[PDB]
Write a protein that binds this ligand. Structure first.
Ligand SMILES: CCCOc1ccc(NC(=O)[C@@H]2CC(=O)Nc3ccccc32)cc1OCCC
Ligand SMILES: CCCOc1ccc(NC(=O)[C@@H]2CC(=O)Nc3ccccc32)cc1OCCC
Ligand SMILES: [Br-]
Ligand SMILES: [Br-]
Ligand SMILES: [Br-]
Ligand SMILES: [Cl-]
Ligand code: NA
Lengths: 306, 301
């Protein structure tokens, strides 16, 4: 029993964090095999924050303009290249702690663990979701650029996020490990406001299924809804549309609890209408939207508390 | 910017987790030096668990009754003993991944990271507080017993919790690593209940300071209070007493934001009396009590 924001165990990723210095700037890199990945903005000065030309800034650098430190050991840089918004530094030593890994680009609503690091040293681990407006609501201070997000299903690390910047509204923007930004964001300090964010409806449904698996039903009702009528209502509360793909994804949680997906949708419509009347659901007084269907199946029992 | 429930990185602890099997029971153990620590209830059948005589049940066991697996490798048990509610298995191999560590017993209101494990394999990490009623609101399924809780300081892991049992309300109970239970619980199948819990006042104040550091100020007001008047309101609302030691501990956050603890205490008194009037704090509609002053300072600087 219980239900917590649950991160993956971080050790496989801790063994990959290094410090990258270019000029007066130090940030984090990811050391996998003989490559160190980091944000390309490490090569920007005071004067390069609005309209950097990264090709022009990089051609000016030699291998020895990059310092990579792994614990107390300097790694020698023997090559460099830029892929989209990531710098790749080839080093003379392969990381002996490199885990089984892959790079994945995720979609809005997907979750991952963030290993927040400073000076190449891990500070803490927490869960995040890719918001519908392609930001993350992280917890990051100066020095955390290059911290990464990942999942570790099936003993393979799936890296999905590298942290680049905090936007003026205090949310966070970054790239996949091929250096493509999530969303319309660019590595410039020009205005680029996040879209108004919305609630990840499929994840709220998943979390209501978790609440039923863990033993609570108070919020259910005798109604159903069509998918169209559900979306017409949910949109009035700035919830994302629920697609037939989302309904399919919820199938297993529906089968485990005996609650049809459109019947759980009718419960959510009534919670949006009514509130909780002083009750909580899994310890929350607000509807939670950063647990995916897959996350619920990862953490909850396979046997409902009936 | 931002504020999240954050666990310590778990790698130092991941390298210590093993699987312990006694007869038909598999659970987790903690491998440090040449000793594996796990819950002593591993020696019990279902029948024994209703009224165990652990002295006698352990007399009936030998080294060969215990199988310890670290990944793919059997560790040979060469001795066994109990310390309180923990079984200690001496093994033929010192863990080469043993971190710098201490065993520390924590106080109610203190937080710690839990590495939830199954079959000796780490599955997840989350942050927990020791409640005032000495339970934790964990997330555990069958096979999680022997999962551990810890804090880090520099390169030193402070192990504070070993998981033993789930209580009927779905909260969790366990021991320190010397086998002493937190709370008035026993490792037997008999009627046990969580006592009525209270809210950790000093932590709520820490979290209001976090909210101010992060720009949420709507709950601030012109008023101050006294420690005596505040404690009468805390008692009324099922909050723990605030001590002068708590006021001193909030010194550095009070220093960082320049809001005296008794000024913030007047905000909390108003929130308890009047509610949040439809507003949130750090995205929560509830007053959060599982961040310590240290947790807030650690994450905000
Ligand atoms: C060439 C352009 C590069 O631009 C940036 C580069 C780096 C950052 N660094 C940060 O955000 C860090 C890490 C973090 O998440 N929060 C935080 C908080 C306080 C101080 C520092 C930070 C920001 C930039 O642009 C911000 C405006 C779009
Ligand atoms: C000897 C200690 C008293 O005997 C027990 C021995 C073991 C357990 N095992 C569990 O709770 C596990 C782990 C967990 O946290 N939740 C969970 C959920 C479903 C199935 C199994 C579990 C419980 C006991 O007593 C329960 C009443 C106090
Ligand atoms: Br007022
Ligand atoms: Br006053
Ligand atoms: Br809440
Ligand atoms: Cl503290
Ligand atoms: Na005040």
């Amino acid at each position: 029993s219980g239900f917590r924001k649950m991160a993956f165990p971080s050790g496989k990723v801790e063994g990959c964090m290094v410090q990258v210095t270019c000029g007066t700037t130090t940030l984090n890199g990811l050391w996998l095999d003989d490559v160190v990945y980091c944000p390309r903005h490490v090569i920007c000065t005071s004067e390069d924050m609005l309209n950097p030309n990264y090709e022009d800034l990089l051609i000016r650098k030699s291998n020895h303009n990059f310092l990579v430190q792994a614990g107390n050991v300097q790694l020698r840089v023997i090559g460099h290249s830029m892929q989209n918004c990531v710098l790749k530094l080839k080093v003379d030593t392969a990381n002996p702690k490199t885990p089984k890994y892959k790079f994945v680009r995720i979609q809005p609503g997907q979750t991952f663990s963030v290993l927040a690091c400073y000076n190449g040293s891990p500070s803490g681990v927490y869960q995040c979701a890719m918001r519908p407006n392609f930001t993350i609501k992280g917890s990051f201070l100066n020095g955390s650029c290059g911290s990464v997000g990942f999942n570790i299903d099936y003993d393979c690390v799936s890296f999905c996020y590298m942290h680049h910047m905090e936007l003026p509204t205090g949310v966070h923007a970054g790239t996949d490990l091929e250096g493509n930004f999530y969303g319309p964001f660019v590595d410039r300090q020009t205005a680029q406001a996040a879209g108004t964010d919305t609630t990840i409806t499929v994840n709220v449904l998943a979390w209501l299924y978790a609440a039923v698996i863990n033993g609570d039903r108070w919020f259910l009702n005798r109604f159903t809804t069509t998918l169209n009528d559900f979306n017409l209502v949910a949109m009035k509360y700035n919830y994302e549309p629920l697609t037939q793909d989302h309904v399919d994804i919820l199938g297993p949680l529906s089968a485990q609890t005996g609650i049809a997906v459109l019947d759980m949708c009718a419960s959510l419509k009534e919670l949006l209408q009514n509130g909780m009347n002083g009750r909580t659901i899994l310890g929350s007084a607000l509807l939670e939207d950063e647990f995916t269907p897959f996350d619920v199946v990862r953490q909850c029992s396979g046997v409902t508390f009936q």
